Scaffold this motif. Structure first.
Motif, PDB file in Angstrom:
ATOM      1  N   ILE A  57       0.684  -0.975   0.035  1.00  0.00           N
ATOM      2  CA  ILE A  57       0.268  -0.178  -0.011  1.00  0.00           C
ATOM      3  C   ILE A  57       0.629   1.388  -0.051  1.00  0.00           C
ATOM      4  CG2 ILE A  57      -2.115  -1.152   1.272  1.00  0.00           C
ATOM      5  CD1 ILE A  57      -1.078   0.122   3.848  1.00  0.00           C
ATOM      6  N   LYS A  58       1.760   0.870   0.600  1.00  0.00           N
ATOM      7  CA  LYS A  58       3.130   2.225   0.231  1.00  0.00           C
ATOM      8  C   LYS A  58       2.612   3.595   0.861  1.00  0.00           C
ATOM      9  CE  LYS A  58       5.209  -0.234  -2.698  1.00  0.00           C
ATOM     10  NZ  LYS A  58       5.763  -0.245  -4.346  1.00  0.00           N
ATOM     11  N   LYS A  60       3.892   6.468   1.851  1.00  0.00           N
ATOM     12  CA  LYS A  60       5.452   7.498   1.830  1.00  0.00           C
ATOM     13  C   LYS A  60       4.626   8.346   0.959  1.00  0.00           C
ATOM     14  CE  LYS A  60       7.016   4.939  -2.064  1.00  0.00           C
ATOM     15  NZ  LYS A  60       7.951   4.159  -2.769  1.00  0.00           N
ATOM     16  N   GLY A  76      -3.607  10.090   2.877  1.00  0.00           N
ATOM     17  CA  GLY A  76      -3.412   8.876   1.465  1.00  0.00           C
ATOM     18  C   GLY A  76      -4.622   9.270   1.424  1.00  0.00           C
ATOM     19  N   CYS A  77      -6.007   9.486   2.000  1.00  0.00           N
ATOM     20  CA  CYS A  77      -7.768   9.455   0.705  1.00  0.00           C
ATOM     21  C   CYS A  77      -7.336  10.854   0.786  1.00  0.00           C
ATOM     22  CB  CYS A  77      -8.469   9.708   2.072  1.00  0.00           C
ATOM     23  SG  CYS A  77      -9.785   9.587   1.448  1.00  0.00           S
ATOM     24  N   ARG A  80      -5.546  11.151  -3.352  1.00  0.00           N
ATOM     25  CA  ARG A  80      -6.272  10.516  -4.175  1.00  0.00           C
ATOM     26  C   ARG A  80      -6.816  11.319  -4.954  1.00  0.00           C
ATOM     27  NH1 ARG A  80      -6.482   8.858  -9.218  1.00  0.00           N
ATOM     28  NH2 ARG A  80      -8.715   7.830  -8.881  1.00  0.00           N
ATOM     29  N   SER A  81      -7.737  12.708  -3.255  1.00  0.00           N
ATOM     30  CA  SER A  81      -8.722  13.781  -3.683  1.00  0.00           C
ATOM     31  C   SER A  81      -7.965  14.622  -5.242  1.00  0.00           C
ATOM     32  CB  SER A  81      -9.486  13.819  -3.130  1.00  0.00           C
ATOM     33  OG  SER A  81     -10.362  14.869  -3.051  1.00  0.00           O
ATOM     34  N   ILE A 118     -16.741  12.997  -7.469  1.00  0.00           N
ATOM     35  CA  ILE A 118     -16.072  11.950  -6.091  1.00  0.00           C
ATOM     36  C   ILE A 118     -16.621  10.639  -5.529  1.00  0.00           C
ATOM     37  CG2 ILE A 118     -14.481  11.958  -4.246  1.00  0.00           C
ATOM     38  CD1 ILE A 118     -12.482  14.286  -5.251  1.00  0.00           C
ATOM     39  N   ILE A 133      -8.027   0.648  -2.265  1.00  0.00           N
ATOM     40  CA  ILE A 133      -6.785   1.559  -2.493  1.00  0.00           C
ATOM     41  C   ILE A 133      -5.742   1.197  -2.960  1.00  0.00           C
ATOM     42  CG2 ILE A 133      -7.788   2.533  -0.246  1.00  0.00           C
ATOM     43  CD1 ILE A 133      -5.421   1.225   1.150  1.00  0.00           C
ATOM     44  N   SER A 134      -4.682   1.768  -2.798  1.00  0.00           N
ATOM     45  CA  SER A 134      -3.605   2.022  -3.598  1.00  0.00           C
ATOM     46  C   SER A 134      -3.285   1.437  -5.043  1.00  0.00           C
ATOM     47  CB  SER A 134      -2.355   1.037  -2.724  1.00  0.00           C
ATOM     48  OG  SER A 134      -2.117   1.547  -1.883  1.00  0.00           O
ATOM     49  N   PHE A 155     -16.037  10.631   8.203  1.00  0.00           N
ATOM     50  CA  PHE A 155     -16.134  10.475   7.232  1.00  0.00           C
ATOM     51  C   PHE A 155     -16.651  10.038   6.058  1.00  0.00           C
ATOM     52  CE2 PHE A 155     -12.689  12.076   3.927  1.00  0.00           C
ATOM     53  CZ  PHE A 155     -13.125  13.286   3.235  1.00  0.00           C
ATOM     54  N   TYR A 265     -13.146  23.636  -1.608  1.00  0.00           N
ATOM     55  CA  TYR A 265     -14.017  23.280  -0.366  1.00  0.00           C
ATOM     56  C   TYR A 265     -14.239  24.985  -0.145  1.00  0.00           C
ATOM     57  CZ  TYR A 265     -13.504  18.770   0.332  1.00  0.00           C
ATOM     58  OH  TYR A 265     -13.829  17.117  -0.407  1.00  0.00           O
TER      59      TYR A 265
HETATM   60  C1  LIG Z   1      -9.855  11.237   1.442  1.00  0.00           C
HETATM   61  C2  LIG Z   1     -10.040  12.590   2.241  1.00  0.00           C
HETATM   62  C3  LIG Z   1     -10.023  13.664   2.033  1.00  0.00           C
HETATM   63  C4  LIG Z   1     -11.189  14.142   1.103  1.00  0.00           C
HETATM   64  N1  LIG Z   1     -11.092  15.470   1.010  1.00  0.00           N
HETATM   65  O1  LIG Z   1     -10.358  16.392   1.693  1.00  0.00           O
HETATM   66  O2  LIG Z   1     -11.831  16.018  -0.318  1.00  0.00           O
HETATM   67  C5  LIG Z   1     -11.120  13.115   0.174  1.00  0.00           C
HETATM   68  C6  LIG Z   1     -11.106  11.549   0.385  1.00  0.00           C
HETATM   69  C7  LIG Z   1     -11.044  10.750  -1.127  1.00  0.00           C
HETATM   70  O3  LIG Z   1     -12.366  11.278  -1.816  1.00  0.00           O
HETATM   71  N2  LIG Z   1     -10.534  10.305  -1.036  1.00  0.00           N
HETATM   72  C8  LIG Z   1     -10.658   9.351  -2.712  1.00  0.00           C
HETATM   73  C9  LIG Z   1     -11.774  10.279  -3.873  1.00  0.00           C
HETATM   74  C10 LIG Z   1     -11.066   9.225  -5.339  1.00  0.00           C
HETATM   75  C11 LIG Z   1     -11.022   8.145  -4.797  1.00  0.00           C
HETATM   76  C12 LIG Z   1     -10.189   7.581  -4.199  1.00  0.00           C
HETATM   77  C13 LIG Z   1     -10.381   8.090  -2.848  1.00  0.00           C
HETATM   78  O4  LIG Z   1      -9.434   8.078  -1.422  1.00  0.00           O
HETATM   79  C14 LIG Z   1      -9.384   6.073  -1.227  1.00  0.00           C
HETATM   80  C15 LIG Z   1      -9.235   6.219  -0.213  1.00  0.00           C
HETATM   81  C16 LIG Z   1      -9.554   5.950   0.731  1.00  0.00           C
HETATM   82  C17 LIG Z   1      -9.097   5.586   1.888  1.00  0.00           C
HETATM   83  C18 LIG Z   1      -7.893   5.393   2.058  1.00  0.00           C
HETATM   84  C19 LIG Z   1      -6.146   6.281   1.016  1.00  0.00           C
HETATM   85  C20 LIG Z   1      -7.282   6.122   0.140  1.00  0.00           C
HETATM   86  C21 LIG Z   1      -6.608   6.763  -1.124  1.00  0.00           C
HETATM   87  N3  LIG Z   1      -5.189   6.730  -1.077  1.00  0.00           N
HETATM   88  C22 LIG Z   1      -4.494   5.803  -1.496  1.00  0.00           C
HETATM   89  O5  LIG Z   1      -4.545   4.211  -1.463  1.00  0.00           O
HETATM   90  C23 LIG Z   1      -2.653   6.304  -1.387  1.00  0.00           C
HETATM   91  C24 LIG Z   1      -2.607   7.891  -1.738  1.00  0.00           C
HETATM   92  C25 LIG Z   1      -0.889   7.468  -1.298  1.00  0.00           C
HETATM   93  C26 LIG Z   1      -0.560   6.951  -1.227  1.00  0.00           C
HETATM   94  C27 LIG Z   1       1.334   7.409  -1.407  1.00  0.00           C
HETATM   95  N4  LIG Z   1       1.656   7.315  -2.381  1.00  0.00           N
HETATM   96  C28 LIG Z   1       3.328   8.050  -2.717  1.00  0.00           C
HETATM   97  C29 LIG Z   1       3.140   8.462  -4.197  1.00  0.00           C
HETATM   98  N5  LIG Z   1       3.427   7.451  -4.977  1.00  0.00           N
HETATM   99  C30 LIG Z   1       4.847   6.551  -4.475  1.00  0.00           C
HETATM  100  C31 LIG Z   1       2.709   6.213  -4.815  1.00  0.00           C
HETATM  101  C32 LIG Z   1       1.183   5.814  -3.671  1.00  0.00           C
HETATM  102  C33 LIG Z   1      -0.614   5.727  -1.162  1.00  0.00           C
HETATM  103  C34 LIG Z   1      -2.000   5.146  -1.032  1.00  0.00           C
END
Ligand SMILES: *c1ccc([N+](=O)[O-])cc1C(=O)Nc1ccccc1OCc1ccccc1CNC(=O)c1ccc(CN2CCN(C)CC2)cc1
Lengths: 269, 10
Positions: A57-58, A60, A76-77, A80-81, A118, A133-134, A155, A265
């Motif tokens: 999942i990484k 970092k 993390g979330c 991705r947003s 989203i 995720i990831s 959330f 926002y």
């Molecule tokens: C979540 C929190 C806040 C907001 N916001 O402020 O509006 C929005 C979100 C959100 O909507 N998330 C979202 C929208 C659409 C699709 C997917 C998501 O998030 C899915 C999710 C839910 C919970 C935890 C994590 C995640 C997705 N994130 C990851 O999988 C993830 C992100 C980053 C990393 C680290 N990366 C560093 C760069 N390289 C090395 C790859 C890894 C790892 C996993």
């Protein structure tokens, strides 16, 4: 007759959807149902498996350097947003006539639109018990997200609630492409200058969306109507999501909101 | 909306 132009529009949209959104619903369901025999997502149900899943999942993205789990998950979330917004924006540019709109309106459509989109993007990654995720490498459980401390515990639940209802419509990527375009081109967003060209484009998209749904789901009736009623609920639902985020911005000093998210926002409802 | 503006023009 003129259906051919609507079918053409639907395909143009699906083609640019494919270019803009790397992780499609098809791929997400494949991973979620195990149709594909890539190695399953690492399931994360607690602090320990969060820790153990770190190879796949990484988490970092905290690279100046860490914090309690709730903050690391939220960031993390959040990460991705930001990319989701970059994607929705590229996809909007492909919608015919959109870039010819006033640039203030382009901004305004996206500002209000991204959040609604989203929620639909998360649905594709979701079942009743968790989220991918990831890029499909991981799967976070719904119980685990709930069990986080406030304000972060509540959330994702509203998105899970919506996702259960929305996914029951059983739309695919070709339906979703046009559905997303319809949301983006709503002429009743606050602070729009030229409503007319927005509504003209949206007329076509709803015609295209109505046709697509009849052809692709002939067995399922009043799907178009079912879908518009969800779209209106979605707008209602996003007004709560905005408020929870104000709190997190103003209360949680450990972390901070990505500037882009601050733009979308800011000054909303 | 500097970033949003920038994503739309680039
Ligand atoms: C979540 C929190 C806040 C907001 N916001 O402020 O509006 C929005 C979100 C959100 O909507 N998330 C979202 C929208 C659409 C699709 C997917 C998501 O998030 C899915 C999710 C839910 C919970 C935890 C994590 C995640 C997705 N994130 C990851 O999988 C993830 C992100 C980053 C990393 C680290 N990366 C560093 C760069 N390289 C090395 C790859 C890894 C790892 C996993």
């Amino acid at each position: 007759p003129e259906s051919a132009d609507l079918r053409a529009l639907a395909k143009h949209l699906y083609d640019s959807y494919i270019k803009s959104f790397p992780l499609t619903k098809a791929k997400a369901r494949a991973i979620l149902t195990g149709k594909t025999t890539d190695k399953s997502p690492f399931v994360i149900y607690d602090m320990n498996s969060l820790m153990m899943g770190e190879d796949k999942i990484k988490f970092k993205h905290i690279t100046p350097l860490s914090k309690e789990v709730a903050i690391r998950i939220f960031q993390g979330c959040q990460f991705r947003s930001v990319e989701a917004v970059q994607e929705i924006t590229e996809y909007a540019k492909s919608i015919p006539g959109f870039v010819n709109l006033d640039l203030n309106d382009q901004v305004t459509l996206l500002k209000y639109g991204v959040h609604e989109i989203i929620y639909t993007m998360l649905a594709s990654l979701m079942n009743k018990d968790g989220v991918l995720i990831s890029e499909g490498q991981g799967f976070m459980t719904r119980e685990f997200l709930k069990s986080l401390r406030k304000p972060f515990g509540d959330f994702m639940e509203p998105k899970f609630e919506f996702a259960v209802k929305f996914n029951a419509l059983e739309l695919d990527d070709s339906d979703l492409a046009i559905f997303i375009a319809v949301i983006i081109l709503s002429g009743d967003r606050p602070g729009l200058l030229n409503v007319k060209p927005i509504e003209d484009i949206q007329d076509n998209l709803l015609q295209a969306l109505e046709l697509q749904l009849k052809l692709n789901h002939p067995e399922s009736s009043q799907l178009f109507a079912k879908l518009l009623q969800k779209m209106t609920d979605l707008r209602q639902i996003v007004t709560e999501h905005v408020q929870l985020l104000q709190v997190i911005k103003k209360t949680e000093t450990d972390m901070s909101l990505h500037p882009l998210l601050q733009e979308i926002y800011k000054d909303l409802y | 909306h500097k970033i949003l503006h920038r994503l739309l023009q680039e």
